[PDB]
Design a protein around this ligand. Structure first.
Ligand SMILES: OC[C@H]1O[C@@H](O[C@H]2[C@H](O)[C@H](O)[C@H](O[C@H]3[C@H](O)[C@H](O)[C@H](O[C@H]4[C@H](O)[C@H](O)[C@H](O[C@H]5[C@H](O)[C@H](O)[C@H](O)O[C@@H]5CO)O[C@@H]4CO)O[C@@H]3CO)O[C@@H]2CO)[C@@H](O)[C@@H](O)[C@@H]1O
Ligand SMILES: OC[C@H]1O[C@@H](O[C@H]2[C@H](O)[C@H](O)[C@H](O)O[C@@H]2CO)[C@@H](O)[C@@H](O)[C@@H]1O
Length: 563
């Protein structure tokens, strides 16, 4: 209990970040206090709350959180955080309406003593921010912002840094954002993760790693990127003898390391563990819930491959139902909630629960993965909520970087997923050893420039059918969407798309290859798009439903407008 206090409860000072701010912007309160508590991360020991009210009756109860300031520096090849001042408490709020808000602070500690502040008034003006990310009410396959604009996630996993810490995100995130990226995913566990909150303990959270997460969230704010926060990863509950990067013997949950659990199976039902997990969810909501740049709360990375001694489907299901209900109830902004599985088809008993707002697929597969992605996307339409292919790679034991240095595998996956009805791109692994050093960001820029001017929420897209190839001496296949105004095609050569040795294609041809006939009514405008250079190649006005295919090396995109 390094942070314990044993003084009578009193507010000593309050700092306010600004009295005028924009819609959805951060309003931060710093609270200096003394009190009686053993653990500032436990609301039964000390409970800080900010009570906000707008002009329209809406009240918000925002939990406060323990905070330490740091100053970062680079010590050769590793980040070092120097503490600045004593720790204190913060409240982080974001206004959804404009106009006036009144608020005050309430604090209660374990003695039952309660103190409060006077009421303060702030004023909120309109801003450029689109709001929080929600499921689209127009098309349940897709996400939107509160203001109605679509959110199509384009990006990759960027789940932890090297020893350089936040200084790696200083490099990766601007490169991603300038190439059309608006999404990434970070890990808040296991204990070795850059942003691990449960580093030494499951009862107290790591203030340095939480500060790094602040920093990276602030960088995403500046770059208009949106983050999935993955709270826990399967390794935490997987025994050393089971392989696959296990970590149970080292995890703070284990009694050997000071935690409440004698075995990982007890995670789902141990009363002490459940209480501390809820405290962690409260801490996460308190410290990060304000942010519209939090796209989603994700409970688990691949919960199905925890130890088989620990995976009890009914208990994992009930835990997800209960925690999703608790998290939603304490989150004033009601962020999206999800979870993930390593098994590519997922677990319908869990994917079907209403408290998970969208489903995911992880798939690592080397052979015919285009067909596998299409099949999984078609299959999971049964859930009637968005589908994110949250992890994708070859099944090559991490050897994607030597097998495919040009990123053709990533290329194939992002085009296939977006044009098959998934909510956004397939999200690659290997951000640090592959995407960045091989400079693969251009693939995302080409795709983003192709899709960004289409409102997917309103096209009523469905997977392409009713088509007829007429192509000789070549095997061309199609992934496509047919909408009320647009038809989007990705054509690929089946004999070239899975070969990765050749250099990046340089500029297709002037020649006719073949044709594809579509069940559509002319006239139409046809745009041919180079998926590697990310540019229009050719435009063609047509009076019939037979679309010529120009010569191309590996793959080609076509945008068709119904006139
Ligand atoms: O440096 C930080 C940290 O790294 C840790 O190791 C990392 C490792 O470097 C990779 O980045 C790896 O990436 C995998 C992620 O876990 C991801 O969620 C996903 O998960 C894998 C899973 O790890 C595992 O490989 C699993 O294996 C399958 C296997 O493919 C086959 O199906 C077999 O029959 O079953 C097992 C499952 O029982 O496959 C999952 C995907 O299906 O895939 C990513 C790529 O592999 O993450 C590691 C951490 O999880 C440690 O070295 C740590 O010490 C170090 O500090
Ligand atoms: O920050 C990510 C890693 O960057 C590395 O530097 C790269 C740099 O980003 C760029 O790609 C340049 O062309 O090559 C450098 C490596 O040769 C390293 O600084 C590494 O430590 C970082 O983790």
């Amino acid at each position: 209990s390094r942070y314990k206090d044993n003084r009578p409860l009193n507010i000593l000072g309050i700092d306010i970040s600004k009295m005028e701010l924009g819609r959805y912007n951060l309003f931060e309160v710093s609270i200096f206090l003394q009190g009686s508590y053993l653990n500032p991360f436990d609301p039964q020991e000390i409970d800080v709350e900010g009570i906000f009210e707008d002009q329209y009756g809406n009240q918000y109860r925002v939990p406060g959180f323990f905070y330490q300031e740091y100053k970062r520096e680079l010590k050769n090849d590793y980040e070092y955080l120097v503490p600045v001042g004593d720790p204190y408490f913060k409240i982080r709020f974001s206004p959804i309406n404009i106009g006036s808000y009144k608020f005050f602070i309430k604090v209660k500690d374990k003695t039952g003593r309660e103190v409060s502040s006077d009421k303060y008034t702030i004023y909120v003006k309109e801003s450029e921010k689109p709001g929080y990310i929600r499921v689209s009410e127009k098309n349940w396959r897709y996400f939107k912002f509160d203001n109605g604009r679509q959110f199509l996630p384009i990006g990759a996993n960027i789940c932890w840094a090297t020893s350089k810490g936040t200084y790696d995100y200083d490099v990766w995130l601007p490169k991603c954002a300038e190439n059309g990226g608006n999404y990434f995913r970070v890990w808040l566990g296991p204990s070795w993760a850059t942003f691990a909150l449960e580093r030494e303990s499951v009862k107290e959270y790591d203030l340095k790693n939480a500060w790094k997460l602040d920093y990276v969230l602030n960088l995403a704010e500046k770059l208009n990127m949106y983050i999935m926060f993955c709270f826990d990863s399967y390794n935490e509950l997987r025994y050393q003898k089971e392989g696959a990067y296990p970590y149970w013997e080292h995890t703070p949950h284990y009694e050997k390391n000071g935690g409440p659990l004698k075995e990982p199976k007890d995670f789902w039902t141990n009363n002490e563990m459940i209480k501390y997990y809820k405290n962690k969810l409260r801490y996460i909501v308190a410290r990060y819930g304000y942010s519209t740049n939090v796209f989603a709360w994700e409970f688990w990375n691949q919960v199905d491959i925890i130890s088989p001694t620990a995976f009890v489907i009914g208990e994992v299901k009930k835990w997800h139902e209960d925690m999703a209900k608790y998290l939603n109830s304490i989150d004033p902004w009601k962020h999206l909630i999800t979870t993930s599985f390593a098994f590519s088809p997922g677990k319908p008993e869990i994917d079907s629960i209403s408290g998970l707002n969208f489903v995911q697929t992880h798939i690592y597969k080397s052979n015919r993965y285009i067909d596998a992605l299409l099949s999984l996307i078609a299959y999971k339409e049964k859930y009637r909520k968005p589908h994110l292919v949250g992890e994708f790679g070859l099944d090559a034991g991490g050897n994607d970087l030597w097998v495919d240095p040009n990123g053709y595998v990533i290329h194939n996956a992002i085009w296939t997923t977006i044009l098959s009805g998934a909510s956004g791109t397939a999200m690659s692994w290997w951000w640090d050893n592959h995407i960045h050093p091989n400079n693969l960001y251009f693939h995302y820029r080409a795709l983003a420039d192709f899709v960004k001017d289409i409102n997917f929420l309103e096209e009523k897209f469905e997977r392409l059918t009713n088509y007829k190839f007429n192509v000789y001496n070549r095997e061309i296949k199609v992934i496509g969407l047919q909408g009320k105004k647009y038809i989007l095609l990705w054509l690929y050569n089946a004999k070239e798309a899975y070969q990765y040795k050749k250099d990046i294609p340089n500029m297709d041809s002037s020649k006719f290859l073949g044709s594809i006939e579509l069940l559509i009514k002319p006239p139409i405008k046809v745009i041919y798009y180079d998926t590697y250079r990310g540019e229009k190649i050719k435009e063609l006005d047509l009076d019939k439903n037979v679309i010529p295919i120009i010569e191309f090396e590996r793959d080609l995109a076509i945008k068709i407008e119904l006139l």
